[PDB]
Amino acid sequence: LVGFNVRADASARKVIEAESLDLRYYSVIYNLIDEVKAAMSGMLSPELKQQIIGLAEVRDVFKSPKFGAIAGCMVTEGVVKRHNPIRVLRDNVVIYEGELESLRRFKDDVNEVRNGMECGIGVKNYNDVRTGDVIEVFEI
RNA sequence: AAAUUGAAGAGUUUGAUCAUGGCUCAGAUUGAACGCUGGCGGCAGGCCUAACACAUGCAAGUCGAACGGUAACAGGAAGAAGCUUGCUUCUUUGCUGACGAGUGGCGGACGGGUGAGUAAUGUCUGGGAAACUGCCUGAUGGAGGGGGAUAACUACUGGAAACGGUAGCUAAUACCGCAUAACGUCGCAAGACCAAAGAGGGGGACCUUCGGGCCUCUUGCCAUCGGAUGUGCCCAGAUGGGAUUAGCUAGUAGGUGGGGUAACGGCUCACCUAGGCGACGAUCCCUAGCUGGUCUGAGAGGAUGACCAGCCACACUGGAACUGAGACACGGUCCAGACUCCUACGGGAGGCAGCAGUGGGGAAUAUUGCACAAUGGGCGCAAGCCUGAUGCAGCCAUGCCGCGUGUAUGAAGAAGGCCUUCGGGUUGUAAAGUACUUUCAGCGGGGAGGAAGGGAGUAAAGUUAAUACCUUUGCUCAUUGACGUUACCCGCAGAAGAAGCACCGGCUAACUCCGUGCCAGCAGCCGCGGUAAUACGGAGGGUGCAAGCGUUAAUCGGAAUUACUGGGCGUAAAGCGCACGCAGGCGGUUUGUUAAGUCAGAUGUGAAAUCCCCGGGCUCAACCUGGGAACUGCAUCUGAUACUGG
RNA sequence: AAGGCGGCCCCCUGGACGAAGACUGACGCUCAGGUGCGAAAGCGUGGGGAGCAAACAGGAUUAGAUACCCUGGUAGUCCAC
RNA sequence: GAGGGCGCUUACCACUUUGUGAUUCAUGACUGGGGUGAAGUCGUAACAAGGUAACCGUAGGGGAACCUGCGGUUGGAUCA
RNA sequence: CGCGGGGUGGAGCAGCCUGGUAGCUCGUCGGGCUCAUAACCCGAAGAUCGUCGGUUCAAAUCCGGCCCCCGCAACCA
C-alpha cells in the first residue's frame, strides 16, 4: 500500500497495525519506481546451477533396503556434501535430478567426501544405476 | 346536533379428502435507497451510518443616562488662515454628536445541537415538607458621614508570537470601615448584631466660588414581609430482558451527638445498636434516554419514540471547583489524557453533538445564501445595537395535495405494424384533415397583505412653583418588507414546451405470433424451459398505475400462527416414569364484625399540539385555524356491604 | 403410586374395601423449587454359576454373509452391599 | 498588632502502575459431526409377515445401512 | 560352506511325530436351476506324495543325500 503523498487516518491505523501489512509513502516518483521493481526482482526464484561443489563418477552399484540403491562412487574433483543439490547425467544429457539424502562411505556415514577418496552415495526416487555416468553436485 | 356507530380471505403437503401446521400473497405505513422515467406549484421532510475527525466565515452581546476618558470621524471655537472677505483648511483645545481600548453593570445558566451515559440524585401518574429564587410585582421604611486602592494612561524594559516586568498616576453605581437598625437574624427573655449609590430631563423668585446650589419629576441602590415564575428535596405505583446470574450489603440499616446544606436526610464524622435488601426477583449480566404521542389493528393488542412539544442527560475524554440568584458552565477557568495548529525553537494556541461547509464511513440525506421586515430573546430611558433563535430563499419527485401535458369533430374505418383458417379482424376516432380553447411554462403590463410600531411636531390630562421635563391618550405630516420578478389581476404568441413504469400461467385485472429447446433464462408462493412455451427473450395486442412506476429494505395486519379478549396436549408439536411435599394458587356451610379488593358519588388533576365532531380561512385540496368531545388514567374524601380478603 | 409383584410355610410390615355407630371440627385440593421411589442393560468389591447367552471361536448358507441356522462359549443373567 | 495572601502540611480524589482472577467478541494449523446438491460406488436396513415382525431403552460387535444379547411396547401380518 | 519353512493333481492345501488304495478347495470339462446369464446345486476328469539310497509286512507320512521354491537372512553404500 503506497501513496505519492498520504497520511494515515485514525480508523486506518487500527486495521494496518492489526493485520500484517505495509504502509510506505514516497515523496518522489523515482524512489517509488525503483522499489516496485525491487519488489518484482525479489519475487523471482531462479537456480541456474550454481557452481559445482564436486563432480563424481559412480561404479559398482550396491543394493540398500531404504533408498533402494547405493551407487559406489569415486570423486574426481571437488568435495561432495550432504544437503547440496545434485545433477545426475549420462552421456552429457541429464538422466535424473535431485538433492542428496544420504552420503555414506563404509559404515562411517560421513557428511563430506573429498576428491580421489573412495565414496558412497544413495538417493530416493532413483531407480536405475548404470556405470559410466557422472553425478554433478553443486552448491547454491 | 355530532364527536371508536366496527371486524372478508387466497395459493401451497394428497391420486383425491378432512384435520393439523408452517411458508407465501392481496392492505395500510416509511426521515428511505436503487433501476427506468421525469413539466409546474402549495405544504411538509431531509446524516437513520462514525457521541468519527474537522480548514474558513458566522452563531453573545450591549449601556457614554455608572466611570476616568479621547484614538478614530464629525462638527464646532479664542486663534492660526484657506482668503477670490463668509465659502473656508490646520495648528490647537473632548467644547459635543459620537466612540477604539479600559474599569463598572446586566447578559455569556437563555435561545440552538445531540442522545453518548443512565433500568434510576431519570421519566410518567399522584401526592408530600424541611427550601432558595436575577429580572417583573404589592407593602413599609432607608438612602447619613468617611477611607485606602486600581485598570486605562505615563516612563523604562523582556518576547518571534501569546502575552509580560518595574515604578509612577487617577475615576466610579469597583472595593472597605464608621454611623443609623426592625414587622430582620440569634436569644425564654433581658439584650446583642446586620445595609446602601448614584445617574439623568426640565426650571420660577433668590444668589454666589458660574461648577451648580435650591425647585421638581424620572430612574437605579439598601432592608424586611409577601405575590408570580423558576429550581432543589422526599414518598407510592408504574416504566425492558436474562436464574445457562440466588444470594447481596461496613456508611452497610438504624440510634445518639457534633459538623454540614438554601433546606430534610449516613450528607459527613465519632460513638452505640446489628441491622438493611432479596424468589412480589435482590445482587450480577445484556440492552436502553422517558413521555405526550406515532404506525398498525374492529378491538384487545403488536411495533415504535425523526420532524412538533414536555422532562432528563451530555458539550473532545477523565476529574475539579471558581464566579454567580442560577453552572459544577455548549462557543468560561484549572489539572490530567488523546489529538491538531503556529514558532524566529526558546515557547504558544484550540475543541462544530450551533448554522453553512470539508474529509471519512455509508445504499443514502441539501447552500460555506438573504434579512432582522415580522414574531421572540439579550442590553439600553430611548434611539438603537446584537440575535445561523426566527422569518425566508437554494438543493433533492422524499412524501402529501392540487393542476397540466389539450377540447370537439373526424371512416369503409387510409398507410404501416400485428393476427388470420386470406373471407377478414385489430391497432383505431387513434393518426392525418377540420375547426376551437390557452390553465401551466414563456413574455410584457399592473399590484394586496404579512406594518404593529418608531420619528418630528401638536393638543388634553395626571405631575409640579410652573404652560418645563416626564408619562398616557387622541391629531396631522413624512416614513419602515429579507422574501420579491410575492399572492392575485390584465395583455401577447401559438397545441404550441410537457408520458413514462410495471404487469398480462393460477393466486390476480390483462393473449397471441415468432425465436429458443432442461439451453439462454424466469421465479413473492405453486412452478415454467427437451419442437404448438399465453410462464424464457422480442414483437403486436391488452391490463393496472401515472410524474411517477417498479425492485429492495422495514413495522403492524391478515396470523385465532403466544390464543386477556381468543388455542391446544389418546393416535397430528405437547401429561414430568411414579409418589410425598414447603412456598404459592384455590377452598365446603352459618352468624357477627371489618371495609383492603369490588361498587357508587363528589372534588382535584390528566400541559398544549395530535386523533375525532361541527364550523372558519387560503380559487380547491393538502395546509392553517375557532369551539367541542375525548384523554377509557391517577389521587383524595364520603358512602354502599352482595361477592372476595381480614 | 409407578417401576413392577406368582411353589409352600412362618415372622416383621404398607395400602384398599365393607358394616355399624362414636369422636375431631374444613384439619381440604393442587404443587414450581426440594426429597424419595424407579424395568432391563451397564458399573465397583466379594461371593455364586445348572440353564440361557452379548463378545469371541469353529461349522454352514451366500455373489459376499463381520448376519439370520448349527456346535461351543466369556461377561451377564443369581446373592450381599 | 488583628486579619489576609504565598509557601509548607494533612484528608478526599482523576490519570497511572503492579500482581492475580472472572467474563465476552474476534481469530487459529487441524479435527468432529450437521445441512445442501442432476447424476457416482457398495450393499438393501425400513415400508407387505418387507422375506429374521418392527420399534424403545441399554450394552457389545461390525465397511455401511445394521447384527446380536437383555428387558419393555403394539404403533405386529397370520391363527389355519 | 549361512539361518526359516515347504515340494501331492492345472494352481494352492489336508492327510503330520498318530507308517496300510491320496482327499479337500479354486480352476478344467459336463450336467442341473433360469425365458436367458450371472450366482448357485449334482458330477466326473485330474498324481512315481520332488527326486534317490535306506528301511519294511505295507512307509504319503519313515532318515539322510541330490535338488528346487519361498522366508528373512543378503548385494548390508
PDB file of all heavy atoms in Angstrom, chain B residues 521-531:
ATOM      1  P     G B 521     -27.628 -16.842 -19.402  1.00  0.00           P
ATOM      2  OP1   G B 521     -26.655 -15.720 -19.383  1.00  0.00           O
ATOM      3  OP2   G B 521     -27.450 -17.997 -18.490  1.00  0.00           O
ATOM      4  O5'   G B 521     -29.086 -16.239 -19.188  1.00  0.00           O
ATOM      5  C5'   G B 521     -29.937 -16.697 -18.142  1.00  0.00           C
ATOM      6  C4'   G B 521     -31.381 -16.425 -18.476  1.00  0.00           C
ATOM      7  O4'   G B 521     -31.901 -17.506 -19.299  1.00  0.00           O
ATOM      8  C3'   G B 521     -32.381 -16.346 -17.329  1.00  0.00           C
ATOM      9  O3'   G B 521     -32.343 -15.115 -16.627  1.00  0.00           O
ATOM     10  C2'   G B 521     -33.683 -16.592 -18.063  1.00  0.00           C
ATOM     11  O2'   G B 521     -34.029 -15.461 -18.852  1.00  0.00           O
ATOM     12  C1'   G B 521     -33.259 -17.721 -18.996  1.00  0.00           C
ATOM     13  N9    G B 521     -33.341 -19.002 -18.297  1.00  0.00           N
ATOM     14  C8    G B 521     -32.286 -19.761 -17.855  1.00  0.00           C
ATOM     15  N7    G B 521     -32.675 -20.844 -17.233  1.00  0.00           N
ATOM     16  C5    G B 521     -34.063 -20.767 -17.256  1.00  0.00           C
ATOM     17  C6    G B 521     -35.034 -21.644 -16.741  1.00  0.00           C
ATOM     18  O6    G B 521     -34.843 -22.698 -16.125  1.00  0.00           O
ATOM     19  N1    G B 521     -36.323 -21.183 -17.000  1.00  0.00           N
ATOM     20  C2    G B 521     -36.634 -20.023 -17.670  1.00  0.00           C
ATOM     21  N2    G B 521     -37.927 -19.718 -17.833  1.00  0.00           N
ATOM     22  N3    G B 521     -35.729 -19.196 -18.149  1.00  0.00           N
ATOM     23  C4    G B 521     -34.485 -19.636 -17.909  1.00  0.00           C
ATOM     24  P     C B 522     -32.809 -15.040 -15.090  1.00  0.00           P
ATOM     25  OP1   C B 522     -32.531 -13.657 -14.590  1.00  0.00           O
ATOM     26  OP2   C B 522     -32.233 -16.176 -14.314  1.00  0.00           O
ATOM     27  O5'   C B 522     -34.372 -15.249 -15.165  1.00  0.00           O
ATOM     28  C5'   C B 522     -35.211 -14.261 -15.732  1.00  0.00           C
ATOM     29  C4'   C B 522     -36.654 -14.685 -15.637  1.00  0.00           C
ATOM     30  O4'   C B 522     -36.780 -16.062 -16.059  1.00  0.00           O
ATOM     31  C3'   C B 522     -37.256 -14.680 -14.248  1.00  0.00           C
ATOM     32  O3'   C B 522     -37.662 -13.394 -13.839  1.00  0.00           O
ATOM     33  C2'   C B 522     -38.402 -15.674 -14.369  1.00  0.00           C
ATOM     34  O2'   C B 522     -39.531 -15.069 -14.978  1.00  0.00           O
ATOM     35  C1'   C B 522     -37.818 -16.694 -15.340  1.00  0.00           C
ATOM     36  N1    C B 522     -37.253 -17.884 -14.675  1.00  0.00           N
ATOM     37  C2    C B 522     -38.120 -18.844 -14.188  1.00  0.00           C
ATOM     38  O2    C B 522     -39.318 -18.614 -14.307  1.00  0.00           O
ATOM     39  N3    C B 522     -37.643 -19.964 -13.600  1.00  0.00           N
ATOM     40  C4    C B 522     -36.319 -20.130 -13.510  1.00  0.00           C
ATOM     41  N4    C B 522     -35.848 -21.242 -12.928  1.00  0.00           N
ATOM     42  C5    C B 522     -35.408 -19.168 -14.026  1.00  0.00           C
ATOM     43  C6    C B 522     -35.914 -18.074 -14.600  1.00  0.00           C
ATOM     44  P     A B 523     -37.273 -12.910 -12.370  1.00  0.00           P
ATOM     45  OP1   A B 523     -37.861 -11.553 -12.228  1.00  0.00           O
ATOM     46  OP2   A B 523     -35.823 -13.099 -12.134  1.00  0.00           O
ATOM     47  O5'   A B 523     -38.052 -13.942 -11.454  1.00  0.00           O
ATOM     48  C5'   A B 523     -39.462 -13.924 -11.431  1.00  0.00           C
ATOM     49  C4'   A B 523     -40.001 -15.092 -10.657  1.00  0.00           C
ATOM     50  O4'   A B 523     -39.613 -16.329 -11.306  1.00  0.00           O
ATOM     51  C3'   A B 523     -39.492 -15.234  -9.234  1.00  0.00           C
ATOM     52  O3'   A B 523     -40.222 -14.403  -8.354  1.00  0.00           O
ATOM     53  C2'   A B 523     -39.682 -16.724  -8.968  1.00  0.00           C
ATOM     54  O2'   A B 523     -41.030 -17.024  -8.644  1.00  0.00           O
ATOM     55  C1'   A B 523     -39.371 -17.328 -10.342  1.00  0.00           C
ATOM     56  N9    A B 523     -37.964 -17.753 -10.470  1.00  0.00           N
ATOM     57  C8    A B 523     -36.927 -17.017 -10.994  1.00  0.00           C
ATOM     58  N7    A B 523     -35.770 -17.635 -10.977  1.00  0.00           N
ATOM     59  C5    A B 523     -36.068 -18.862 -10.406  1.00  0.00           C
ATOM     60  C6    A B 523     -35.268 -19.970 -10.109  1.00  0.00           C
ATOM     61  N6    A B 523     -33.965 -20.012 -10.368  1.00  0.00           N
ATOM     62  N1    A B 523     -35.852 -21.034  -9.536  1.00  0.00           N
ATOM     63  C2    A B 523     -37.161 -20.970  -9.278  1.00  0.00           C
ATOM     64  N3    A B 523     -38.025 -19.994  -9.527  1.00  0.00           N
ATOM     65  C4    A B 523     -37.408 -18.951 -10.092  1.00  0.00           C
ATOM     66  P     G B 524     -39.536 -13.587  -7.147  1.00  0.00           P
ATOM     67  OP1   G B 524     -40.063 -12.206  -7.232  1.00  0.00           O
ATOM     68  OP2   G B 524     -38.078 -13.797  -7.062  1.00  0.00           O
ATOM     69  O5'   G B 524     -40.213 -14.239  -5.866  1.00  0.00           O
ATOM     70  C5'   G B 524     -39.952 -13.749  -4.570  1.00  0.00           C
ATOM     71  C4'   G B 524     -41.152 -13.898  -3.681  1.00  0.00           C
ATOM     72  O4'   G B 524     -42.149 -12.922  -4.065  1.00  0.00           O
ATOM     73  C3'   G B 524     -41.868 -15.231  -3.763  1.00  0.00           C
ATOM     74  O3'   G B 524     -41.288 -16.173  -2.893  1.00  0.00           O
ATOM     75  C2'   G B 524     -43.294 -14.871  -3.383  1.00  0.00           C
ATOM     76  O2'   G B 524     -43.441 -14.779  -1.977  1.00  0.00           O
ATOM     77  C1'   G B 524     -43.430 -13.473  -3.975  1.00  0.00           C
ATOM     78  N9    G B 524     -43.998 -13.472  -5.332  1.00  0.00           N
ATOM     79  C8    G B 524     -43.338 -13.101  -6.472  1.00  0.00           C
ATOM     80  N7    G B 524     -44.083 -13.169  -7.540  1.00  0.00           N
ATOM     81  C5    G B 524     -45.299 -13.604  -7.056  1.00  0.00           C
ATOM     82  C6    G B 524     -46.484 -13.864  -7.756  1.00  0.00           C
ATOM     83  O6    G B 524     -46.659 -13.743  -8.977  1.00  0.00           O
ATOM     84  N1    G B 524     -47.498 -14.283  -6.892  1.00  0.00           N
ATOM     85  C2    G B 524     -47.369 -14.435  -5.535  1.00  0.00           C
ATOM     86  N2    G B 524     -48.434 -14.852  -4.846  1.00  0.00           N
ATOM     87  N3    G B 524     -46.260 -14.188  -4.877  1.00  0.00           N
ATOM     88  C4    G B 524     -45.277 -13.780  -5.701  1.00  0.00           C
ATOM     89  P     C B 525     -40.674 -17.545  -3.442  1.00  0.00           P
ATOM     90  OP1   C B 525     -39.654 -17.950  -2.466  1.00  0.00           O
ATOM     91  OP2   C B 525     -40.387 -17.431  -4.893  1.00  0.00           O
ATOM     92  O5'   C B 525     -41.857 -18.579  -3.263  1.00  0.00           O
ATOM     93  C5'   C B 525     -42.464 -18.728  -1.996  1.00  0.00           C
ATOM     94  C4'   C B 525     -43.837 -19.302  -2.140  1.00  0.00           C
ATOM     95  O4'   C B 525     -44.736 -18.295  -2.660  1.00  0.00           O
ATOM     96  C3'   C B 525     -43.956 -20.427  -3.132  1.00  0.00           C
ATOM     97  O3'   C B 525     -43.483 -21.651  -2.629  1.00  0.00           O
ATOM     98  C2'   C B 525     -45.439 -20.412  -3.456  1.00  0.00           C
ATOM     99  O2'   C B 525     -46.198 -21.005  -2.410  1.00  0.00           O
ATOM    100  C1'   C B 525     -45.712 -18.908  -3.476  1.00  0.00           C
ATOM    101  N1    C B 525     -45.601 -18.338  -4.835  1.00  0.00           N
ATOM    102  C2    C B 525     -46.729 -18.342  -5.643  1.00  0.00           C
ATOM    103  O2    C B 525     -47.779 -18.838  -5.194  1.00  0.00           O
ATOM    104  N3    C B 525     -46.640 -17.820  -6.893  1.00  0.00           N
ATOM    105  C4    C B 525     -45.491 -17.312  -7.337  1.00  0.00           C
ATOM    106  N4    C B 525     -45.464 -16.806  -8.574  1.00  0.00           N
ATOM    107  C5    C B 525     -44.322 -17.294  -6.523  1.00  0.00           C
ATOM    108  C6    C B 525     -44.430 -17.809  -5.289  1.00  0.00           C
ATOM    109  P     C B 526     -42.711 -22.648  -3.619  1.00  0.00           P
ATOM    110  OP1   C B 526     -42.148 -23.677  -2.703  1.00  0.00           O
ATOM    111  OP2   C B 526     -41.808 -21.840  -4.483  1.00  0.00           O
ATOM    112  O5'   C B 526     -43.849 -23.265  -4.541  1.00  0.00           O
ATOM    113  C5'   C B 526     -44.808 -24.174  -4.019  1.00  0.00           C
ATOM    114  C4'   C B 526     -45.967 -24.397  -4.963  1.00  0.00           C
ATOM    115  O4'   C B 526     -46.588 -23.125  -5.285  1.00  0.00           O
ATOM    116  C3'   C B 526     -45.672 -25.012  -6.327  1.00  0.00           C
ATOM    117  O3'   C B 526     -45.537 -26.424  -6.296  1.00  0.00           O
ATOM    118  C2'   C B 526     -46.883 -24.571  -7.140  1.00  0.00           C
ATOM    119  O2'   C B 526     -48.015 -25.378  -6.848  1.00  0.00           O
ATOM    120  C1'   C B 526     -47.121 -23.167  -6.595  1.00  0.00           C
ATOM    121  N1    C B 526     -46.425 -22.149  -7.411  1.00  0.00           N
ATOM    122  C2    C B 526     -47.037 -21.589  -8.534  1.00  0.00           C
ATOM    123  O2    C B 526     -48.189 -21.942  -8.842  1.00  0.00           O
ATOM    124  N3    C B 526     -46.349 -20.657  -9.255  1.00  0.00           N
ATOM    125  C4    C B 526     -45.105 -20.304  -8.908  1.00  0.00           C
ATOM    126  N4    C B 526     -44.469 -19.387  -9.633  1.00  0.00           N
ATOM    127  C5    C B 526     -44.464 -20.866  -7.772  1.00  0.00           C
ATOM    128  C6    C B 526     -45.155 -21.775  -7.064  1.00  0.00           C
ATOM    129  P     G B 527     -44.234 -27.163  -6.892  1.00  0.00           P
ATOM    130  OP1   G B 527     -44.331 -28.604  -6.447  1.00  0.00           O
ATOM    131  OP2   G B 527     -43.006 -26.339  -6.644  1.00  0.00           O
ATOM    132  O5'   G B 527     -44.357 -27.107  -8.481  1.00  0.00           O
ATOM    133  C5'   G B 527     -45.536 -26.698  -9.124  1.00  0.00           C
ATOM    134  C4'   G B 527     -45.316 -25.534 -10.071  1.00  0.00           C
ATOM    135  O4'   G B 527     -44.502 -24.491  -9.477  1.00  0.00           O
ATOM    136  C3'   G B 527     -44.596 -25.788 -11.374  1.00  0.00           C
ATOM    137  O3'   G B 527     -45.321 -26.568 -12.303  1.00  0.00           O
ATOM    138  C2'   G B 527     -44.358 -24.357 -11.834  1.00  0.00           C
ATOM    139  O2'   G B 527     -45.586 -23.742 -12.192  1.00  0.00           O
ATOM    140  C1'   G B 527     -43.907 -23.733 -10.521  1.00  0.00           C
ATOM    141  N9    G B 527     -42.443 -23.804 -10.433  1.00  0.00           N
ATOM    142  C8    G B 527     -41.667 -24.683  -9.776  1.00  0.00           C
ATOM    143  N7    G B 527     -40.363 -24.432 -10.014  1.00  0.00           N
ATOM    144  C5    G B 527     -40.313 -23.401 -10.862  1.00  0.00           C
ATOM    145  C6    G B 527     -39.212 -22.646 -11.511  1.00  0.00           C
ATOM    146  O6    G B 527     -38.013 -22.916 -11.329  1.00  0.00           O
ATOM    147  N1    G B 527     -39.554 -21.648 -12.333  1.00  0.00           N
ATOM    148  C2    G B 527     -40.839 -21.325 -12.559  1.00  0.00           C
ATOM    149  N2    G B 527     -41.132 -20.299 -13.395  1.00  0.00           N
ATOM    150  N3    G B 527     -41.873 -21.979 -11.993  1.00  0.00           N
ATOM    151  C4    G B 527     -41.670 -23.007 -11.155  1.00  0.00           C
ATOM    152  P     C B 528     -44.590 -27.053 -13.644  1.00  0.00           P
ATOM    153  OP1   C B 528     -45.483 -27.947 -14.411  1.00  0.00           O
ATOM    154  OP2   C B 528     -43.224 -27.497 -13.296  1.00  0.00           O
ATOM    155  O5'   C B 528     -44.455 -25.702 -14.460  1.00  0.00           O
ATOM    156  C5'   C B 528     -43.791 -25.696 -15.693  1.00  0.00           C
ATOM    157  C4'   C B 528     -43.720 -24.321 -16.288  1.00  0.00           C
ATOM    158  O4'   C B 528     -43.122 -23.372 -15.357  1.00  0.00           O
ATOM    159  C3'   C B 528     -42.839 -24.255 -17.509  1.00  0.00           C
ATOM    160  O3'   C B 528     -43.518 -24.714 -18.645  1.00  0.00           O
ATOM    161  C2'   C B 528     -42.410 -22.796 -17.539  1.00  0.00           C
ATOM    162  O2'   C B 528     -43.438 -21.967 -18.058  1.00  0.00           O
ATOM    163  C1'   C B 528     -42.221 -22.525 -16.047  1.00  0.00           C
ATOM    164  N1    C B 528     -40.853 -22.900 -15.615  1.00  0.00           N
ATOM    165  C2    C B 528     -39.712 -22.209 -16.088  1.00  0.00           C
ATOM    166  O2    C B 528     -39.812 -21.228 -16.851  1.00  0.00           O
ATOM    167  N3    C B 528     -38.493 -22.636 -15.692  1.00  0.00           N
ATOM    168  C4    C B 528     -38.368 -23.681 -14.878  1.00  0.00           C
ATOM    169  N4    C B 528     -37.134 -24.040 -14.522  1.00  0.00           N
ATOM    170  C5    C B 528     -39.495 -24.397 -14.394  1.00  0.00           C
ATOM    171  C6    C B 528     -40.701 -23.983 -14.784  1.00  0.00           C
ATOM    172  P     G B 529     -43.108 -26.123 -19.287  1.00  0.00           P
ATOM    173  OP1   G B 529     -44.028 -26.296 -20.444  1.00  0.00           O
ATOM    174  OP2   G B 529     -43.072 -27.198 -18.264  1.00  0.00           O
ATOM    175  O5'   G B 529     -41.645 -25.808 -19.819  1.00  0.00           O
ATOM    176  C5'   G B 529     -41.488 -24.741 -20.743  1.00  0.00           C
ATOM    177  C4'   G B 529     -40.056 -24.494 -21.139  1.00  0.00           C
ATOM    178  O4'   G B 529     -39.318 -23.979 -20.007  1.00  0.00           O
ATOM    179  C3'   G B 529     -39.225 -25.682 -21.596  1.00  0.00           C
ATOM    180  O3'   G B 529     -39.499 -26.089 -22.923  1.00  0.00           O
ATOM    181  C2'   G B 529     -37.803 -25.155 -21.423  1.00  0.00           C
ATOM    182  O2'   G B 529     -37.399 -24.337 -22.520  1.00  0.00           O
ATOM    183  C1'   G B 529     -37.948 -24.288 -20.162  1.00  0.00           C
ATOM    184  N9    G B 529     -37.473 -25.007 -18.978  1.00  0.00           N
ATOM    185  C8    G B 529     -38.153 -25.832 -18.120  1.00  0.00           C
ATOM    186  N7    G B 529     -37.376 -26.337 -17.199  1.00  0.00           N
ATOM    187  C5    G B 529     -36.114 -25.820 -17.489  1.00  0.00           C
ATOM    188  C6    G B 529     -34.859 -26.003 -16.858  1.00  0.00           C
ATOM    189  O6    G B 529     -34.600 -26.683 -15.863  1.00  0.00           O
ATOM    190  N1    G B 529     -33.845 -25.295 -17.492  1.00  0.00           N
ATOM    191  C2    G B 529     -34.021 -24.508 -18.593  1.00  0.00           C
ATOM    192  N2    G B 529     -32.923 -23.911 -19.053  1.00  0.00           N
ATOM    193  N3    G B 529     -35.180 -24.321 -19.201  1.00  0.00           N
ATOM    194  C4    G B 529     -36.163 -25.006 -18.589  1.00  0.00           C
ATOM    195  P     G B 530     -40.230 -27.491 -23.233  1.00  0.00           P
ATOM    196  OP1   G B 530     -41.510 -27.224 -23.936  1.00  0.00           O
ATOM    197  OP2   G B 530     -40.208 -28.342 -22.031  1.00  0.00           O
ATOM    198  O5'   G B 530     -39.332 -28.152 -24.360  1.00  0.00           O
ATOM    199  C5'   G B 530     -37.930 -28.246 -24.217  1.00  0.00           C
ATOM    200  C4'   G B 530     -37.366 -29.342 -25.089  1.00  0.00           C
ATOM    201  O4'   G B 530     -36.202 -29.900 -24.437  1.00  0.00           O
ATOM    202  C3'   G B 530     -38.304 -30.519 -25.350  1.00  0.00           C
ATOM    203  O3'   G B 530     -38.981 -30.328 -26.579  1.00  0.00           O
ATOM    204  C2'   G B 530     -37.393 -31.739 -25.366  1.00  0.00           C
ATOM    205  O2'   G B 530     -36.928 -31.996 -26.682  1.00  0.00           O
ATOM    206  C1'   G B 530     -36.216 -31.300 -24.495  1.00  0.00           C
ATOM    207  N9    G B 530     -36.261 -31.766 -23.100  1.00  0.00           N
ATOM    208  C8    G B 530     -35.115 -32.000 -22.395  1.00  0.00           C
ATOM    209  N7    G B 530     -35.325 -32.358 -21.160  1.00  0.00           N
ATOM    210  C5    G B 530     -36.702 -32.334 -21.047  1.00  0.00           C
ATOM    211  C6    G B 530     -37.483 -32.642 -19.917  1.00  0.00           C
ATOM    212  O6    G B 530     -37.067 -32.996 -18.802  1.00  0.00           O
ATOM    213  N1    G B 530     -38.839 -32.504 -20.189  1.00  0.00           N
ATOM    214  C2    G B 530     -39.350 -32.112 -21.404  1.00  0.00           C
ATOM    215  N2    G B 530     -40.688 -32.032 -21.477  1.00  0.00           N
ATOM    216  N3    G B 530     -38.618 -31.820 -22.472  1.00  0.00           N
ATOM    217  C4    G B 530     -37.303 -31.951 -22.224  1.00  0.00           C
ATOM    218  P     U B 531     -40.057 -31.376 -27.143  1.00  0.00           P
ATOM    219  OP1   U B 531     -41.139 -31.434 -26.140  1.00  0.00           O
ATOM    220  OP2   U B 531     -39.436 -32.641 -27.610  1.00  0.00           O
ATOM    221  O5'   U B 531     -40.619 -30.643 -28.434  1.00  0.00           O
ATOM    222  C5'   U B 531     -41.737 -29.769 -28.359  1.00  0.00           C
ATOM    223  C4'   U B 531     -42.025 -29.134 -29.695  1.00  0.00           C
ATOM    224  O4'   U B 531     -40.938 -28.227 -30.016  1.00  0.00           O
ATOM    225  C3'   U B 531     -42.133 -30.101 -30.873  1.00  0.00           C
ATOM    226  O3'   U B 531     -43.093 -29.632 -31.825  1.00  0.00           O
ATOM    227  C2'   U B 531     -40.748 -30.039 -31.498  1.00  0.00           C
ATOM    228  O2'   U B 531     -40.724 -30.385 -32.868  1.00  0.00           O
ATOM    229  C1'   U B 531     -40.377 -28.577 -31.268  1.00  0.00           C
ATOM    230  N1    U B 531     -38.931 -28.323 -31.207  1.00  0.00           N
ATOM    231  C2    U B 531     -38.334 -27.634 -32.249  1.00  0.00           C
ATOM    232  O2    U B 531     -38.934 -27.215 -33.220  1.00  0.00           O
ATOM    233  N3    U B 531     -36.984 -27.447 -32.127  1.00  0.00           N
ATOM    234  C4    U B 531     -36.186 -27.868 -31.090  1.00  0.00           C
ATOM    235  O4    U B 531     -34.984 -27.602 -31.139  1.00  0.00           O
ATOM    236  C5    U B 531     -36.870 -28.571 -30.038  1.00  0.00           C
ATOM    237  C6    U B 531     -38.191 -28.768 -30.134  1.00  0.00           C
TER     238        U B 531
END
